Design a protein around this ligand. Structure first.
Ligand SMILES: CCCCCCCCO[C@@H]1O[C@H](CO)[C@@H](O)[C@H](O)[C@H]1O
Ligand SMILES: [Ca+2]
Length: 652
């Protein structure tokens, strides 16, 4: 796991946990270049997450990227993803792979992110963590982690974590309640190993919603429709995963990973009463009950014929079957009335793949991989009323995704690389559902997006840190956009190309006395090359969500036995919220400071810390609902907030 193969960046857990609420990924990995993450502070929705513009256009979920929590997929076959599962009080590391090689990781993999949980070791240590922040937020958690032996057959290892978090919300109708349970266990079968994962999330959050420009300027914490319709969500999910690994040959390894999980959600929307009267409308309440399961097999043969070549092959099967329903708001009233939608939508994914690393010469290697994505959608519709036809339908998609990188080592401390690949974006099941034709059935004409990505990078170990550089462009084509939309049913279309250019620069350094410095910047000019609007020429326009410029810089003094401190700074360029480029979110800069003491006397380790976020009380909006239907894009953010945390660790 070294910064050297490609444009890959790895963030450590104990540092992502250092004087932080341990709630949102945003607070931790906000500095990875090319990775745009913003915390909506709305636990009825997901983080605004994107990689080099991938998934930026997404409105309510995360799309166009790949996320794995302990090898369990967080993005579904169709590309839709979520973020509520991550327990930051028990994370080992987060690896982000951006660039063409992300295409190895599924259908809509413009960039793949992999979260893995702590392994546990000697001694059996128990931790009690607590944090309290402004606007009535507070979180606590217990983590027990240890091992039965050294690290041998029979040697077992355990890590359990539970956390509970509740907030009264900065803005009206935003209080949330979130409980996490995350466990990981391992047993050494022989010198062949095994592992189990158990994930559980339970959220009951009020969705504040968005605010229109006039509404945000007038009052920042206002949530007019929030209490009018009781906009809120409740999420519950449990995942079980199982992984086996065994070294067959002295030079050939192999592994298999399978997962089973169940998600269940309820969303009360702020949809008015008039539009729902049309018999074809789906309602104002969305109910979703999905089962997902999958199996992934990998064979890594370090056998070398032709040159020193190590290659990995494998097969992946992913399955998600959902029963989806909809309801009224009438009795808009806060509870749900007559049933107005019913379906079973299955989506499953099959595809082989393989990567190879050839050490053609010394200080020059060629990495190359391919994958054949095959995705199937079926919808069995159960709602056929006089006006709402039988919308059942079925479709499939296939594509060859290839990727490759040439790596040349100027030294062992400096390696440069050049990579390229093609990408793929299937239409979501929600996108095919309806057609502007008016005929009953799926819109079988819609085809997926094509990519065309090129990148160069230079990774240099200087001092005890690393300086990485990367430059990239992406050719999007057949972008899936909206065509018609009336009577509560949105229809989609293929129209237009796009081009997205950008650059990433990062530098990390550490010095004796643990003086640590970190910096990074990222440029992204993502423009359209074709009209993607029925009534307006949107050709030259920006891409909404992407920040033309962003940057991060932090400096920290971290002694191991006493007073520690640090301070961060984050710059976010002006980001457009429309395809037409009708609205913009301000360019804003935000500062943060923190101090604390780490008293570790023999077994007990008591860590105490305080935090000032948004030190200069800058007023801003840190999230936007891209392409909101009615123009309510803005999601304001609090000003100069604080937090304080206390952690206790006892070692056995
Ligand atoms: C290791 C197993 C890899 C191949 C797994 C293929 C299993 C997918 O099987 C599919 O299941 C769907 C419902 O679940 C059915 O609708 C399809 O008829 C069937 O092909
Ligand atoms: Ca129907």
């Amino acid at each position: 796991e070294l910064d050297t193969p490609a444009a890959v960046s790895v963030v450590d857990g104990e540092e992502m946990r250092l004087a932080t609420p341990r709630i949102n990924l945003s607070e931790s990995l906000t500095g990875v270049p090319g990775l745009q993450v913003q915390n909506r502070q709305n636990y009825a929705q997901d983080l605004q997450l994107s990689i080099r513009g991938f998934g930026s256009r997404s409105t309510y979920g995360i799309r166009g990227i790949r996320l794995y929590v302990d090898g369990i997929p967080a993005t579904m076959p169709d590309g839709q993803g979520q973020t509520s599962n991550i327990d930051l009080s028990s994370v080992q590391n987060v690896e982000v792979l951006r660039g063409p090689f992300s295409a190895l990781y599924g259908n809509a993999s413009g960039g793949v992110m992999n979260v893995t949980t702590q392994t546990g070791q000697q001694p059996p240590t128990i931790e009690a963590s607590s944090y309290y922040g402004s606007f009535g937020s507070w979180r606590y958690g217990l983590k027990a982690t240890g091992a039965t032996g050294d690290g041998q057959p029979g040697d077992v290892d355990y890590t359990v974590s539970t956390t509970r978090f509740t907030t009264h919300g900065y803005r009206d109708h935003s209080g949330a309640q979130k409980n996490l349970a995350n466990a990981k266990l391992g047993v050494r079968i022989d010198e062949s190993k095994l592992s189990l994962i158990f994930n559980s999330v339970d959220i009951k959050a009020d969705d504040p919603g968005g605010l229109t420009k006039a509404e945000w300027k007038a009052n920042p914490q206002q949530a007019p429709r929030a209490e009018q319709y009781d906009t809120r969500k409740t999420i519950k999910q449990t995942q079980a995963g199982l992984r086996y690994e065994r070294s067959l040959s002295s030079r050939d390894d192999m592994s298999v990973m399978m997962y089973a999980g169940e998600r269940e959600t309820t969303q009360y929307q702020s949809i008015p009463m008039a539009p729902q009267l049309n018999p074809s409308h789906a309602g104002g309440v969305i109910t979703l009950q999905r089962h997902y399961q999958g199996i992934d097999s990998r064979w890594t043969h370090r056998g070398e014929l032709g040159v020193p070549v190590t290659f990995t092959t494998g097969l992946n099967y992913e399955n998600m079957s959902e029963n989806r329903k909809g309801y009224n708001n009438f009795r808009e009233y806060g509870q749900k009335g007559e049933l107005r939608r019913d379906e079973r939508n299955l989506m499953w994914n099959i595809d082989p793949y393989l990567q190879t690393q050839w050490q053609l010469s010394e200080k020059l290697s060629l990495d190359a991989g391919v994958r054949y994505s095959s995705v199937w959608f079926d919808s069995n519709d159960h709602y056929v009323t006089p006006g709402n036809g039988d919308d059942s339908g079925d479709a499939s998609y296939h594509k060859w995704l290839p990727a490759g990188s040439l790596k040349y080592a100027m030294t062992d401390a400096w390696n440069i690389y050049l990579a390229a690949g093609r990408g793929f974006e299937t239409p979501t099941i929600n996108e095919l559902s309806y057609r502007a034709d008016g005929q009953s059935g799926m819109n079988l004409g819609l085809k997926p997006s094509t990519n065309d990505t090129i990148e160069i990078g230079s990774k240099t170990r200087i001092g005890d840190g690393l300086l990485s550089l990367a430059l990239f462009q992406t050719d999007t084509d057949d972008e899936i956009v909206v065509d018609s939309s009336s009577g509560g049913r949105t229809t989609y279309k293929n129209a237009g190309k796009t081009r997205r250019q950008g650059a990433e620069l990062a530098w990390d350094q550490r010095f004796a006395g643990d003086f640590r410095v970190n910096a990074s910047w990222t440029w992204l000019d993502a423009t359209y090359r074709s009209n993607v609007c029925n009534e307006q020429d949107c050709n030259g326009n920006r891409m909404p969500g992407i920040a033309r410029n962003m940057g991060f810089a932090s400096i920290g003094y971290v002694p191991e036995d006493g007073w520690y401190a640090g301070t961060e700074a984050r710059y976010m360029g002006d980001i457009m919220a429309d395809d037409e480029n009708t609205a913009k979110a301000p360019s804003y800069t935000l500062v943060g400071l923190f101090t604390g003491y780490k008293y570790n006397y023999h077994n007990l380790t008591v860590d105490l810390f305080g935090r000032v976020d948004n030190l200069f009380d800058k007023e801003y909006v840190g999230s936007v609902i891209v392409n909101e239907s009615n123009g309510r894009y803005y999601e304001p953010s609090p000003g100069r907030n604080y937090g304080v945390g206390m952690n206790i660790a006892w070692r056995f």
